[PDB]
């Protein structure tokens, strides 16, 4: 039974509008409807992992699990295993996997974050799940962010609170938030970003949707515009949107957008919007390909339509050598030349680096760097040829070239991280000096850069 090199992952997000689902929801799991849809020839082929995020979910965990599992069994004739389920209020995440994967999946974590204070604490936030699939770490976040067209800044703040405070993955990676803990991170939900056009343009927008002409709407989508301005979701990818806005529909049809202000909306307009989204972030030079991204047309219980996305994702095996795990492999080493951090900080403390990777027995602290002033005001922290030589547990290039080094630059004064990034060991050559680079972030905002050269020695 060979271990897989690649799996497929289904991501679903649905704001159920506090209504039970209809009797058949199979179109969701088949990626059928509008947008980038899955080929009919794949209908009976199960995805390896199904991750279902709901918002405004009125069902008990048991009720929803029975619907999901019976849906997948009808499609695939496979009885899926429940990996995890976690609910905060009416925000839920379910992870299901093919039974063959049960003994490939370990280190399952769940968490939630509640967003806002007082007034604004009580129904918005996120749930998430992480686990290891053989040698690959996977994270999944379902968030229901603040509603309303004039609250994009609140949504961005909700995003920053969720990635700071959601405690998933390896707790030993203490300087790193969820945006650095996983080989593949999927972030989805009712993110509630709107099409920011004048209220008076509602019927014009509906016309454009009927013509399947999305370009002049997407140019005003708040998630795309905020992400282009580095206000939210920095370093996350999204597949091009080619499906109609998924909100706000009259229930029991899809023929009508319900946009006008009502007492039930707090006298707010809900112009047609792409509230319901799937984004991802994978470590550099790991295979990840979006195969589908769309919405269903035939599930009409809610004022939102379900959204699906599917991915091919590279995975690695749980590697054992004669040496590591349990010792180092002296045939392996990672060296750093001409390295320096450029930081945006106005502060003047000394900095050191920490190197974290599951290819090391434990994280490695460098000596302090030498601070200089950049020509445009910046702090440059020079490590020159001073960084430690990293001793991987396994030297086999089929293992080592698939690994990644997380880097934190920390203040000597406070031991607080000022920036985090990631370097792939998937190099063009071994025993050769090659440029490396990562942006540095802190709380998912850009704080600087790390660049230099690497020299990787493997057993080959
Ligand atoms: C066009 C655009 O917004 N790109 C982007 C922004 C932030 N982070 C990642 C990406 C790929």
UniProtKB/Swiss-Prot annotation:
One of its GO terms (biological process) is positive regulation of B cell differentiation. Its main location: cytoplasm. Tyrosine phosphorylated by the members of the SRC family after exposure to a diverse array of extracellular stimuli such as cytokines, growth factors, antibodies, chemokines, integrin ligands and hypertonic and oxidative stress. Phosphorylated upon IgG receptor FCGR2B-binding. Keywords: Apoptosis, Cell membrane, Cytoplasm, Cytoskeleton, Hydrolase, Immunity, Lipid metabolism, Membrane, Phosphoprotein, Repeat, SH2 domain, SH3-binding. The keyword Repeat applies. GO terms for cellular component: cytoplasm; cytoskeleton; cytosol; membrane raft; plasma membrane. Specifically expressed in immune and hematopoietic cells. Expressed in bone marrow and blood cells. Levels vary considerably within this compartment. Present in at least 74% of immature CD34+ cells, whereas within the more mature population of CD33+ cells, it is present in only 10% of cells. Present in the majority of T-cells, while it is present in a minority of B-cells (at protein level). The keyword Cell membrane applies. One of its GO terms (molecular function) is phosphatidylinositol-3,4,5-trisphosphate 5-phosphatase activity. It is found in: Cytoplasm; Cell membrane; Membrane raft; Cytoplasm, Cytoskeleton. Belongs to the inositol 1,4,5-trisphosphate 5-phosphatase family. Phosphatidylinositol (PtdIns) phosphatase that specifically hydrolyzes the 5-phosphate of phosphatidylinositol-3,4,5-trisphosphate (PtdIns(3,4,5)P3) to produce PtdIns(3,4)P2, thereby negatively regulating the PI3K (phosphoinositide 3-kinase) pathways. Able also to hydrolyzes the 5-phosphate of phosphatidylinositol-4,5-bisphosphate (PtdIns(4,5)P3) and inositol 1,3,4,5-tetrakisphosphate. Acts as a negative regulator of B-cell antigen receptor signaling. The SH2 domain interacts with tyrosine phosphorylated forms of proteins such as SHC1 or PTPN11/SHP-2. It competes with that of GRB2 for binding to phosphorylated SHC1 to inhibit the Ras pathway. It is also required for tyrosine phosphorylation. Interacts with tyrosine phosphorylated form of SHC1. Interacts with tyrosine phosphorylated form of DOK1. Interacts with tyrosine phosphorylated form of DOK3. Interacts with tyrosine phosphorylated form of SLAMF1/CD150. Interacts with PTPN11 in response to IL-3. Interacts with receptor EPOR. Interacts with receptors MS4A2/FCER1B and FCER1G. Interacts with receptors FCGR2B and FCGR3. Interacts with receptor FCGR2A, leading to regulate gene expression during the phagocytic process. Interacts with GRB2. Interacts with PLCG1. Interacts with tyrosine kinases SRC and TEC. Interacts with c-Met/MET. This is Phosphatidylinositol 3,4,5-trisphosphate 5-phosphatase 1. It comes from Homo sapiens.
């Amino acid at each position: 039974q060979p271990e897989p090199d690649m799996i497929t992952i289904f991501i679903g997000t649905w704001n159920m509008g506090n209504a039970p689902p209809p009797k058949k929801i199979t179109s969701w799991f088949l990626s059928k409807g509008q947008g980038k849809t899955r080929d009919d020839s794949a209908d009976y082929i199960p995805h390896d992992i199904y991750v279902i995020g709901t918002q405004e979910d009125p069902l008990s965990e048991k009720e929803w699990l029975e619907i999901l599992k019976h849906s997948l069994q009808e499609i695939t004739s496979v009885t899926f295993k429940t990996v995890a389920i976690h609910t905060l209020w009416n925000i839920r995440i379910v992870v299901l996997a093919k039974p063959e994967h049960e003994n490939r999946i370990s280190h399952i974590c769940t968490d939630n974050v509640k967003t806002g204070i007082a007034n604004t604490l009580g129904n918005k936030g996120a749930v998430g799940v992480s686990f290891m699939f053989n040698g690959t770490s996977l994270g999944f976040v379902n968030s229901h962010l603040t509603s309303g067209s004039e609250k994009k800044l609140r949504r961005n703040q909700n995003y920053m609170n969720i990635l700071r405070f959601l405690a998933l993955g390896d707790k030993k990676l203490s300087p790193f938030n969820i945006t650095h803990r996983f080989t593949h991170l999927f972030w989805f939900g009712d993110l509630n970003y709107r099409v920011d056009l004048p209220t008076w343009e509602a019927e014009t927008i509906i016309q454009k949707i009927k013509q399947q002409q999305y370009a002049d709407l997407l140019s005003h989508d708040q998630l795309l515009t905020e992400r282009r301005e580095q206000k939210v979701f920095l370093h996350f990818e999204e597949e091009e949107i080619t499906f109609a806005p998924t909100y706000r529909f009259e229930r029991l049809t899809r023929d009508k957008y319900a946009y006008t202000k009502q007492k039930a909306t707090g006298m707010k307009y809900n112009l047609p919007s792409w509230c319901d989204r799937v984004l991802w972030k994978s470590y550099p030079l790991v295979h990840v390909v979006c195969q589908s991204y769309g919405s269903t047309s035939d599930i009409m219980t809610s004022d939102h339509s379900p959204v699906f996305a599917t991915f091919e994702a590279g995975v690695t095996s749980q590697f054992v050598s004669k040496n590591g795990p349990g010792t180092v492999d002296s045939q392996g080493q990672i060296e750093f030349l001409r390295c320096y951090a450029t930081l945006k900080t106005k502060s003047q403390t000394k900095f050191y680096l920490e190197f974290h990777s599951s290819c090391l027995e434990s994280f490695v602290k460098s000596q302090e760097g030498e601070n200089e002033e950049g020509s445009e005001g910046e702090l440059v922290v020079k490590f020159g040829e001073t960084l430690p030589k990293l001793k991987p547990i396994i030297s086999d290039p089929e293992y080592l070239l698939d690994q990644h080094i997380l880097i934190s630059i920390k203040s000597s004064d406070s031991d607080e991280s000022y920036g985090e990034g990631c370097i792939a060991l998937r190099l063009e050559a071994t025993e050769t000096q090659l440029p490396i680079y990562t942006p540095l972030t802190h709380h998912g905002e850009l704080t600087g850069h790390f660049q230099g050269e690497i020299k990787l020695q493997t057993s080959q």
